[PDB]
């Protein structure tokens, strides 16, 4: 036949996540190819936003937090339709510190744990601790946790005054200062007797998606005298001699994969001492986004009234769920329908009608991501 019948496809897929500034102009794109004319239609959180249009771009003139969320387009032409992989638009912003001043106490020789003041913001801001206008960096006796929690180890009388933070939003440059947390050190000035080692900030069960550059476990401990305090990290019972930083309070695993998943434990102990060591540990879980193992031929031809199977096999951690679309419409695979979904993921269509012709598209989804693959089904006479 004289006319072109190249079905729609995506030249490129959109980013999974993108942070954009409040009030900026946002231009989402459907980078689709296929025989002309191609029409485009947009979804926001799976609710229709626009009607089919020749325009492949969706433009938001000024972006606010209401317009955040998931976007995906549907593209069609004479052949059929495809559903795009969605992108999450995240609107950067920052408010102001609203909690107000706080008062906190700690006993001599114990550690003061001061959570950082909460501020509404995206992304999470860069937090710096201050006291008396001077920055408070990590040291032998001062820890700062992955959550910007200040931990003052083996507190003494001078460790008392007003502590506050500075928050900087690296996307919009905003710079705000919190209300102080006032710290009191009590029962000051006894004999500086030794205090047995305790773990104040224990390892957290941690998840990370493969492809992430780094994952960190954290363990903050207290003892008196601090100079004798020693932190040892263990994987599978054997001490780790690499990847440790930040006064032994951190363990870094570079480019983690499932091989690095398992139980990591932290042991706090005192050198030249008879005191018992204390151990706390957690599980590192590594997720893998869906990857196709088998994708269908881009074209499948089957005879009318016959049966056809369309393969779709994907791997992932956790094992991904599989969803079928016919021209961007969810396929209903309930009984009393000609459509059955295989255990290996494949879609089986029986009693083929000529209307079954068109794009069949398969999504593999899990918490770590989504992948899509498709084929043109032609039902011949
Ligand atoms: C941290 O999580 C574990 C369980 O996590 C799962 O099991 C691991 C073996 C590993 O497969 C991880 O990737 C999993 O996500 C919690 O362990 C449970 O602890 C309770 C008692 O507290 C016990 O009765 C259950 O049997 C445990 N469950 C399992 C599956 O082992 C552990 O408590 C978590 N630690 C936290 C939240 O601090
Ligand atoms: C935030 O503002 C204060 C006051 O102008 C300034 O001293 C500080 O350096 C700023 N922080 C950053 C990260 O720019």
Numbering used by the authors: -1 to 379
Copied sentences from the primary study:
Sdk1 and Sdk2 are single-pass transmembrane proteins, with extracellular regions composed of 6 N-terminal immunoglobulin (Ig) domains followed by 13 fibronectin type III (FNIII) domains, and a relatively short intracellular domain terminating in a Postsynaptic density/Discs Large/ZO-1 (PDZ) binding motif. Here, we report the crystal structures of cell-cell adhesive homophilic dimers of mouse Sdk1 and Sdk2, each mediated by the four N-terminal Ig domains. These four domains adopt a horseshoe conformation, like many other IgSF cell-cell recognition proteins, but they interact in a unique back-to-back anti-parallel manner not previously observed. Overall, our data suggest a model in which Sdks form cis dimers on isolated cell surfaces, which dissociate to form trans dimers through the same interface when contact is made to a cell surface expressing the cognate Sdk.
The Ig1:Ig1 interface, for both Sdk1 and Sdk2, is centered on N22, which hydrogen bonds with the main chain of R23, and is supported by interactions between hydrophobic residues (L19, V25). Mutating residues in the central Ig1:Ig1 interface (N22R in Sdk1 and N22R, N22S and H18R/N22S in Sdk2) resulted in the loss of dimerization for both Sdk1 and Sdk2 in AUC experiments. These results—particularly the Sdk2 N22S mutation—highlight the critical importance of N22 and the two hydrogen bonds it forms to the dimer interaction. Consistent with this, a crystal structure of Sdk2Ig1–4 H18R/N22S showed a loss of the back-to-back dimer interaction. The Ig1–2 interface mutants (Sdk1 N22R and Sdk2 H18R/N22S) showed a loss of both homophilic and heterophilic binding revealing that the heterophilic interaction observed here is mediated by the same interface as the homophilic interaction.
